[PDB]
Amino acid sequence: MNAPDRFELFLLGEGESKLKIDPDTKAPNAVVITFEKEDHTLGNLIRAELLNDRKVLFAAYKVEHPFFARFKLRIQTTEGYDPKDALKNACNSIINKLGALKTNFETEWNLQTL
Amino acid sequence: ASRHGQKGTIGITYRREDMPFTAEGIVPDLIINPHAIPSRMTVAHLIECLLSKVAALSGNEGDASPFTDITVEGISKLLREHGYQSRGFEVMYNGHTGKKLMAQIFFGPTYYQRLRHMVDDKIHARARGPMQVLTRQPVEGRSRDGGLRFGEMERDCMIAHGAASFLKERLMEASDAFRVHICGICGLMTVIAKLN
Amino acid sequence: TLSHLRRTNTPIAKPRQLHNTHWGLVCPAETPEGQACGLVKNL
Amino acid sequence: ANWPLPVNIRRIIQNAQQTFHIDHTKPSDLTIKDIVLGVKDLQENLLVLRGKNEIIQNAQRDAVTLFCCLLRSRLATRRVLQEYRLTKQAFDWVLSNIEAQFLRSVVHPGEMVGVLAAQSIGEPATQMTLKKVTSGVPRLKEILNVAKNMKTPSLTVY
Amino acid sequence: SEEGPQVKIREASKDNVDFILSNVDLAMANSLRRVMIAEIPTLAIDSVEVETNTTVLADEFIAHRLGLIPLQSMDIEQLEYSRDCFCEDHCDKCSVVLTLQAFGESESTTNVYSKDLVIVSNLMGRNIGHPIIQDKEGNGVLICKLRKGQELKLTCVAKKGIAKEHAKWGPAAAIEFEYDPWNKLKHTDYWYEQDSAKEWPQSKNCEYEDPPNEGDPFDYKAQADTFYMNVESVGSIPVDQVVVRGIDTLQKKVASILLALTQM
Amino acid sequence: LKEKAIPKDQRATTPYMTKYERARILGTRALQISMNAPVFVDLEGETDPLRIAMKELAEKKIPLVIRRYLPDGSFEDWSVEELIVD
Amino acid sequence: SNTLFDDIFQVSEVDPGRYNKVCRIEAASTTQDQCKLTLDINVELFPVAAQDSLTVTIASSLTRSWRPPQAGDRSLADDYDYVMYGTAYKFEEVSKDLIAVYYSFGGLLMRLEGNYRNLNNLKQENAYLLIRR
Amino acid sequence: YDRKVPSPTGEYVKEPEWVLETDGVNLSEVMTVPGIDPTRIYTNSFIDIMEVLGIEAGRAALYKEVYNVIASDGSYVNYRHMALLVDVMTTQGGLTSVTRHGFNRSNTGALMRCSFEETVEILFEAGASAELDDCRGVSENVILGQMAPIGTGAFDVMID
Amino acid sequence: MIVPVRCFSCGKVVGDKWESYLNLLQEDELDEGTALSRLGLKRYCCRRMILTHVDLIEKFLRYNP
Amino acid sequence: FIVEDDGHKELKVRKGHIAKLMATEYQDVEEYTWSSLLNEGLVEYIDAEEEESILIAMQPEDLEPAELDVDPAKRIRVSHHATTFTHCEIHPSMILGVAASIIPFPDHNQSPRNTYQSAMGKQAMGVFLTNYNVRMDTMANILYYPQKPLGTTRAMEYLKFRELPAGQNAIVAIACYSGY
Amino acid sequence: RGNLMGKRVDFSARTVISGDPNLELDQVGVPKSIAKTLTYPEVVTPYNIDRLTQLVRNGPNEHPGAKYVIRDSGDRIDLRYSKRAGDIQLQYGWKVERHIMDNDPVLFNRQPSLHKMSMMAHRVKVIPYSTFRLNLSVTSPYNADFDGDEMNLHVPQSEETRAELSQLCAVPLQIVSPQSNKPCMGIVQDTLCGIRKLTLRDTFIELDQVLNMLYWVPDWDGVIPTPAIIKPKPLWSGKQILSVAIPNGIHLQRFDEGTTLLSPKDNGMLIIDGQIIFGVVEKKTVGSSNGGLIHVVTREKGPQVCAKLFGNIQKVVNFWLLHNGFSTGIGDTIADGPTMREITETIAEAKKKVLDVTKEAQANLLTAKHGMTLRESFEDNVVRFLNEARDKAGRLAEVNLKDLNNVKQMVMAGSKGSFINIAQMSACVGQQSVEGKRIAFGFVDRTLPHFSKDDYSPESKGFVENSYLRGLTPQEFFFHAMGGREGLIDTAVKTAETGYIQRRLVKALEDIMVHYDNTTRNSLGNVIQFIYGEDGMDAAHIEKQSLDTIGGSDAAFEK
RNA sequence: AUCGAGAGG
Numbered sequence A: 001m002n003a004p005d006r007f008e009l010f011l012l013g014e015g016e017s018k019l020k021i022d023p024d025t026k027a028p029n030a031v032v033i034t035f036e037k038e039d040h041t042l043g044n045l046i047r048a049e050l051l052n053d054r055k056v057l058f059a060a061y062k063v064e065h066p067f068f069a070r071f072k073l074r075i076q077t078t079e080g081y082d083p084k085d086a087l088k089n090a091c092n093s094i095i096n097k098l099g100a101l102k103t104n105f106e107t108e109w110n111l112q113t114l
Numbered sequence B: 001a002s003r004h005g006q007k008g009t010i011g012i013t014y015r016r017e018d019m020p021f022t023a024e025g026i027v028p029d030l031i032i033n034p035h036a037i038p039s040r041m042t043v044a045h046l047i048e049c050l051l052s053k054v055a056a057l058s059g060n061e062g063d064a065s066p067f068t069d070i071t072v073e074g075i076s077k078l079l080r081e082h083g084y085q086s087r088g089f090e091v092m093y094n095g096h097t098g099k100k101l102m103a104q105i106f107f108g109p110t111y112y113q114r115l116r117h118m119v120d121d122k123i124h125a126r127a128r129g130p131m132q133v134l135t136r137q138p139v140e141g142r143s144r145d146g147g148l149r150f151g152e153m154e155r156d157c158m159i160a161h162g163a164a165s166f167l168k169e170r171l172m173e174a175s176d177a178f179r180v181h182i183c184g185i186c187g188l189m190t191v192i193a194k195l196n
Numbered sequence C: 001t002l003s004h005l006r007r008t009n010t011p012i013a014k015p016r017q018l019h020n021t022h023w024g025l026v027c028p029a030e031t032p033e034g035q036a037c038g039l040v041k042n043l
Numbered sequence D: 001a002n003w004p005l006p007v008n009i010r011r012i013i014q015n016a017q018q019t020f021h022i023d024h025t026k027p028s029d030l031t032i033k034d035i036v037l038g039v040k041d042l043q044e045n046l047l048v049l050r051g052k053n054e055i056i057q058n059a060q061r062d063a064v065t066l067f068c069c070l071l072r073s074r075l076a077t078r079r080v081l082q083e084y085r086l087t088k089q090a091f092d093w094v095l096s097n098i099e100a101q102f103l104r105s106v107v108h109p110g111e112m113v114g115v116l117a118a119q120s121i122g123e124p125a126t127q128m129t130l131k132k133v134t135s136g137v138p139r140l141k142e143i144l145n146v147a148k149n150m151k152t153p154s155l156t157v158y
Numbered sequence E: 001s002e003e004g005p006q007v008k009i010r011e012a013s014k015d016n017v018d019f020i021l022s023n024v025d026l027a028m029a030n031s032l033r034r035v036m037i038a039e040i041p042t043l044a045i046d047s048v049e050v051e052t053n054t055t056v057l058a059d060e061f062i063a064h065r066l067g068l069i070p071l072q073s074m075d076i077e078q079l080e081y082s083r084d085c086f087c088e089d090h091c092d093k094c095s096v097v098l099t100l101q102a103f104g105e106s107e108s109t110t111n112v113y114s115k116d117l118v119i120v121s122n123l124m125g126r127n128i129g130h131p132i133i134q135d136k137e138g139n140g141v142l143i144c145k146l147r148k149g150q151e152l153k154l155t156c157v158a159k160k161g162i163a164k165e166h167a168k169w170g171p172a173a174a175i176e177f178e179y180d181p182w183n184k185l186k187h188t189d190y191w192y193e194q195d196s197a198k199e200w201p202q203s204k205n206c207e208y209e210d211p212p213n214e215g216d217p218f219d220y221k222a223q224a225d226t227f228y229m230n231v232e233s234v235g236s237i238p239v240d241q242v243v244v245r246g247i248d249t250l251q252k253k254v255a256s257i258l259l260a261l262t263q264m
Numbered sequence F: 001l002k003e004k005a006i007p008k009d010q011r012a013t014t015p016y017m018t019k020y021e022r023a024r025i026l027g028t029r030a031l032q033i034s035m036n037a038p039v040f041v042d043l044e045g046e047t048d049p050l051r052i053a054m055k056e057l058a059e060k061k062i063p064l065v066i067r068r069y070l071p072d073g074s075f076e077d078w079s080v081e082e083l084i085v086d
Numbered sequence G: 001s002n003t004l005f006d007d008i009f010q011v012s013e014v015d016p017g018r019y020n021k022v023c024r025i026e027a028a029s030t031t032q033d034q035c036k037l038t039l040d041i042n043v044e045l046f047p048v049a050a051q052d053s054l055t056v057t058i059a060s061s062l063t064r065s066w067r068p069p070q071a072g073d074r075s076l077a078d079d080y081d082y083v084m085y086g087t088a089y090k091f092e093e094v095s096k097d098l099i100a101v102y103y104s105f106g107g108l109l110m111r112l113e114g115n116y117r118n119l120n121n122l123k124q125e126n127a128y129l130l131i132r133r
Numbered sequence H: 001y002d003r004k005v006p007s008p009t010g011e012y013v014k015e016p017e018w019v020l021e022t023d024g025v026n027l028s029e030v031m032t033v034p035g036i037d038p039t040r041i042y043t044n045s046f047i048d049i050m051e052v053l054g055i056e057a058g059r060a061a062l063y064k065e066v067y068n069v070i071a072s073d074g075s076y077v078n079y080r081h082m083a084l085l086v087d088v089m090t091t092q093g094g095l096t097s098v099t100r101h102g103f104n105r106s107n108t109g110a111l112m113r114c115s116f117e118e119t120v121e122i123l124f125e126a127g128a129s130a131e132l133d134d135c136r137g138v139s140e141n142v143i144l145g146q147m148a149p150i151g152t153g154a155f156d157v158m159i160d
Numbered sequence I: 001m002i003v004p005v006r007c008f009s010c011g012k013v014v015g016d017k018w019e020s021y022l023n024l025l026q027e028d029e030l031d032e033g034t035a036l037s038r039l040g041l042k043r044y045c046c047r048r049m050i051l052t053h054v055d056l057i058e059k060f061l062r063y064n065p
Numbered sequence J: 001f002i003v004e005d006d007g008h009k010e011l012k013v014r015k016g017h018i019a020k021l022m023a024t025e026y027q028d029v030e031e032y033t034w035s036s037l038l039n040e041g042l043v044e045y046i047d048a049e050e051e052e053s054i055l056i057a058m059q060p061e062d063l064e065p066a067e068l069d070v071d072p073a074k075r076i077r078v079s080h081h082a083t084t085f086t087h088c089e090i091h092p093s094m095i096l097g098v099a100a101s102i103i104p105f106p107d108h109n110q111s112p113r114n115t116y117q118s119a120m121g122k123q124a125m126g127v128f129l130t131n132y133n134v135r136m137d138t139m140a141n142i143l144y145y146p147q148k149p150l151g152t153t154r155a156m157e158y159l160k161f162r163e164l165p166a167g168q169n170a171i172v173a174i175a176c177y178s179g180y
Numbered sequence K: 001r002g003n004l005m006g007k008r009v010d011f012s013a014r015t016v017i018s019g020d021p022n023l024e025l026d027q028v029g030v031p032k033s034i035a036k037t038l039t040y041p042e043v044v045t046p047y048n049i050d051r052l053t054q055l056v057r058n059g060p061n062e063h064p065g066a067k068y069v070i071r072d073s074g075d076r077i078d079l080r081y082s083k084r085a086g087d088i089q090l091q092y093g094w095k096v097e098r099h100i101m102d103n104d105p106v107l108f109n110r111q112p113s114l115h116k117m118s119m120m121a122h123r124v125k126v127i128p129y130s131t132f133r134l135n136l137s138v139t140s141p142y143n144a145d146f147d148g149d150e151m152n153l154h155v156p157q158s159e160e161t162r163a164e165l166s167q168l169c170a171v172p173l174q175i176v177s178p179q180s181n182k183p184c185m186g187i188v189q190d191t192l193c194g195i196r197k198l199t200l201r202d203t204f205i206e207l208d209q210v211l212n213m214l215y216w217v218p219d220w221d222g223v224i225p226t227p228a229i230i231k232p233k234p235l236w237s238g239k240q241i242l243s244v245a246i247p248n249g250i251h252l253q254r255f256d257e258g259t260t261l262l263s264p265k266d267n268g269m270l271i272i273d274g275q276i277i278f279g280v281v282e283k284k285t286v287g288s289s290n291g292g293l294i295h296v297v298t299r300e301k302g303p304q305v306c307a308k309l310f311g312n313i314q315k316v317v318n319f320w321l322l323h324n325g326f327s328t329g330i331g332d333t334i335a336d337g338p339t340m341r342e343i344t345e346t347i348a349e350a351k352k353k354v355l356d357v358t359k360e361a362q363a364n365l366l367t368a369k370h371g372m373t374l375r376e377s378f379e380d381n382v383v384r385f386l387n388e389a390r391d392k393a394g395r396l397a398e399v400n401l402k403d404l405n406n407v408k409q410m411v412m413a414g415s416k417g418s419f420i421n422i423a424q425m426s427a428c429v430g431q432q433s434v435e436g437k438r439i440a441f442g443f444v445d446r447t448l449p450h451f452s453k454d455d456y457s458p459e460s461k462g463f464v465e466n467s468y469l470r471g472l473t474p475q476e477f478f479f480h481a482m483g484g485r486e487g488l489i490d491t492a493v494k495t496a497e498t499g500y501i502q503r504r505l506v507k508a509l510e511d512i513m514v515h516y517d518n519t520t521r522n523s524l525g526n527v528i529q530f531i532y533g534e535d536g537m538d539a540a541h542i543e544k545q546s547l548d549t550i551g552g553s554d555a556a557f558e559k
Numbered sequence L: 001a002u003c004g005a006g007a008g009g
Ligand SMILES: Nc1ncnc2c1ncn2[C@@H]1O[C@H](COP(=O)(O)CP(=O)(O)OP(=O)(O)O)[C@@H](O)[C@H]1O
Pocket: B039, B040, K112, K140, K143, K144, K145, L009
């Protein structure tokens, strides 16, 4: 009855930016990004890869409510270093890893016989 | 609800990827909070989980008959023969993260029953609504778009709070308000007032 | 349906309490809650 | 000793030594006279009935007698310097904070003392659930309604 | 091969593929599992219209069953979401239309299988909508049973969808994870009345990793890079394509984040 | 009856505002703010009448006098500015 | 900005109670009767041999948000195998001219009594414990 | 019974004491009996205590047994509420029960009285004796719908 | 009422097995567990759908109207 | 059941009688029915007043002569220390009513919880009859895929609950999670 | 009784309630359709007029919207059906019946209205699903639980009424109850179970989990606490992560039998400036108590800070417990074999003692005490023997229970469970009691027809030797059923009686209130008490404080 | 509406 339509959680809505960026108040070089129409699947990779980078001081994500799917990511980096650059570097490294693994597993599958 | 008197309302629904998963990939259809069990002292729920898992793996129907000599140790020996842990506790991984849970989690098949009481069927609300004529007060029941009763106990609960104007608004303006004319010598409603 | 088919009512030394005499004839626990407890029982 | 009392003096003391960082080695700056005089003045300060007339003043003195006893117990001049390294500023802040908390702790006029008391008794009574003495809700009913007969009359002689 | 993660596949089947994933942070594998379960898109009947139903089963029940029926989705990438198309209700490019008609001509009950469903819309030379049969007999999955004198006739519109909207579109059934089987990382605390080793069952994957030694101290620095997994396919999409499509879906999500950032 | 009022000198009501009377004053001030009555404090990003009334209480600018009755019928009057709120 | 106290202590006995990761350690200052220390340790993080003699140091430094350890960019404050951060709750005297220091490092309790240093180990929020094999 | 007593040094001490319990109560004769302490005697029944000694003593005993029924279940209630109820019973004449007769014999407003029980009879007696109700009671203004002189309503608010 | 299409937990298709499953136990006097193993339903989640379900459809068929 | 002298007191009902009753069960030779057992005198009907004179035994095996390494898990059973039972209970589960006979291992649970479950079985969703689609009912509710319970009472066989269940065997996890 | 003081009310709602850990304690999860049905009249004002107009353009069906508009004349304008619903231009002074929007006072009610805390004002958060969602900590004052319970909600229709609800009926004000000198609200759930586990010195958080948990705290200032252990690896105690949630400048001290300043057992607590020095958190630490943590935080900081503290503790503990996991288990009920056999020999010793006492009663050698029947003394002795047997078996089980035992965890935290529950499920369920006596012979001289005549032995008397795990015997089942049936009868009659008692109490003294002279009197003026409580002080401020003068020796007093 | 029945906390 009152339940929201399922399509909302995988598809974006009207007037909704995918990413909204707001600097953290009373924090140095820190900013929170409100990923919209996303879930834990996307957030965990970003947090882990930001934590791998030495220049990224902070890496955490949270869901404000399990009801609707949005997640906030907090990033704090070294002075003289833009947080968005850290996010994009982590994303690109993720993509490179995905490609490498897919090629290796495709070769293994072709090697496999069934 | 389930047998053994456990009563539950699903506060939320979780897709399978969000939910925790076992090593074999089996995710529980439902998950229940532990704290309900110790106060109720219903061991048969746990033994039902155990015997139902044993029966599902063995293909042999489980005997839930009372006054029958069934040893929990024996059923756990059978479950160990199947390869799952004797107590039925199984290692589980958090769905959101993928990390192994520090404490192993006990899940097994269990019979559950849906109940007549349905939330969507039960919800009721009322703005300015239909009023029964005799008291000029809200009608009874959800079916007649009625208004909930302000119990006397509720009246007192508001009385001791000190919300005098809140009680006045809820008990005069919200329901059966009326304006009447009284003549001073009479002290009664007899006086007929022509407003035009 | 079956439990409604097999129903007893006691209109009203303490009737509600389960009696030793009820063994083997009346179910020990199949009694409704509220005011109906004890007075109404299933065979 | 353990009894319900207002203002919770010991907590004010812990807040005193943490709000003002306290060095144990340094001697207290408080003269002996000031502690006693301030405690007496504070006893005068903690007013609960506004009138200055002698009978309402006597009711006020009696009403605050127990609190004054506790205050004297925790503000003894030996106690103040020995247990803690009270400074004059810390002692004055404790005095003012005790006065403020006591003033907050006064009943607000107009509060429906009645219905509150009735429900205060009602709430645990619902919680009360089931050897030769009457107890429980039947005993409470006997207590509530003047009973010419008690189910368990008893007399304890010493 | 390529520096990065590496996969060594233990077993392979059209249904199940077993593999070993190495040099990976755990979060990556978990998020891939979530994408594989839900986010991979397939084709499924999003709309059923029944003209006649004489069966005992009610129409809504049947429509739910039809939604859960598996349909081939190997060429699903060439098909486009119904909401993304410009058609009034559905387009031959965005939706696939099927028809099902059956009558219990025999006094013996005649069943309804997935082989009985037929397709109206133009294939356009793409492998989409073929009923999927893993049955040895070749008969499809049962939908209803028809006594003599029972006729059912209906038309199905099948659209593209993602399992997050509804569980039917999910391409995979069971995903099997196992990391740190010896519990060297001690990420879990075992429960035992007398002995952990006796009561607990040793994992199968546990035999592939090297056994620990008690005398050696617990390595604090250690983090697990070796994982053991098994993927299951309903047959709508082959296993290798399912996992590769999960990889591509995750990379597309990341790219969409990057593109939103460039617009920012 | 007449001159039931206690004089201002030696007032015996509580200097602290009872929570009930601050609540009533805030309610009435919020009512008149929602009624578009003039506001005597500058507002900084506030559109809700009750929050405006709270700010006015902090500024102590709100003019009104509480009539505090006594059981005999005598009434003592306390202006808002005289009352102290903690 | 220097170390508050240095010494070498040999553990009389090690006993973990109701915890697997955290043990309790007892020792006294070598050659000195006045100083003895007892405190909690993570033996899983750093194994503590029975009858082992270990060096123990307490330092004030080397607020400000913690930063992940720069990979050699900042030189190590110590080669010591083990280190902890803690804060003192109260300092008492077991007797006149006999001092006792009470500390808690992340809930892991520490107590050392001794008169060999009175000015040092002064009550302060900042305190660090360094232990070498 | 173990009882707390001041030691010679002033500390707590606990000395055993012989106490006797009786299944019937006739206090007036029992207290005059020698060999008993007249100051330590206690009885379950409040009414006998009120008749024998005085109304304040009965009030204290009543509060004591209410305290007992509260503490048997382990629950705790702060003294002021029980004291208010006990004094409500105690203040007038002897002891006034919380029953229909307990409240109805009071000369309070007729409507507050009629709310509890015997509604029509109370209203009838008020009508026959031409009883005047002040309308100051809370339930009377609840029935009138006017805001009760309660909390917020007690104090009047006047403009400058 | 009729054989579930897929196990709610497993997600694997389970309807296609049912028609064979019955024949497996009647033709060869097979144990239910060995029959479920022959079907390939290793997990107990997919096993419970086959073992617990009962075909109420057959009773429903008997009514001519 | 009826107990009478044989030289030990032995149950009147014997093995061959059970075999004949099972043979008549299989066909559905001469009919063996409960009326046949009553006329044979192998069983009797006892009201409440008549129970006072009689003496009963829960388990038939108690009548067999007595005489260690008993398994620890088995529940403690007091040696009867009694003789001259007139009758033996057919099976204890028969005291339970219809709603209670559904409950699994009620002997291992507190009785009030069994009572509460007996109250909820009435509210349980279920297929009341196979004629539902033909019948017109003011309110009718039925499960999409009803399934028989995994653990069943023996009495459940005669309750026809397995044939016409009213619940789902769902995988149940006892676990702490989000907190809802 | 039922129409003047029990009037049905306009602008009311009712729903099944479920609990939301992420939902703030102050808020309630009002469903969207309820908020659509519920209207608040608002006069159009220059500050809000823009917003108001926008709502009317959205329409009644979608929230934020509005159902009705009222002109200066008062002729109604219906937004659902009207030709002008789209082109409205609001003139000043008009009324708009806005939908119920977030951060609006509402009145939340649980059906047994025996308590002021049952009827309390909440903020509103409009939420999709149809269940009302409340915080887990707000269940206790309402006595509510999510076993299908239904709760009510009301909406004020005037501005001064909203102010009364917010200034008097707000949840934060009612956090400290007048009765009991104790807070109502407490943290009693999985949160309470896992707070103990997190505070364990054994438990240690890792950098990634530390950052996520720190971020979870809403008021988090951004300080990264220094790890408790650094050189081997950066690790954080659960105490530090929890101390992030503790407000600055608060000090708590807990003393029990084992609270050494060393505190090897880690019992008790010490907090200075919002930092937890030592201890393991438990029900006394957090759950509502005189001088509790919520009590101190409410007293010093204020109510809003303590409500935020509720929220923060719940968030942190719930995340940590979610990542750590926990479960009840059947194995948690199962006990060691040797301990079980020790329990059985305990039972046998009790049986032999009962046998010997009965044999003495047979020889008429025992002499009764004054005022006691010989049968009464025999019954009392056997009853006490069986009670001691049950309690001893439970104690053996509890010593045999290990720390990993999950029921033991729940009991140690105080979230759920009791010693009697553990004992009944583990070793022996005890002796059954009917009408204050052991099981009686309903049949003449036999409790059951199977039992022999004139049997006073414990099995006939209804003492159940078996545990819940072991399996009750049929006779024991019937005896237990008799006991449970008496319990149900008692609960029903008790609810009726307590309702009548509370009604009579409330009607008796409803009038009495403190007047402006601080005397407590009625409408007629008769003074019940000259000073409320004889001190004239609000009950919430009062807390138990020790008096040093009353106790101790004269010598210690002097020193 | 009336009466009654059942049921939920
Ligand atoms: N503080 C508490 N609040 C609510 N339920 C509690 C409770 N403590 C224990 N319970 C549980 O309440 C259950 C009893 O069932 P019910 O009486 O129907 C709910 P209740 O809140 O106790 O009274 P109610 O009937 O007025 O709702 C017990 O199983 C018990 O575990």
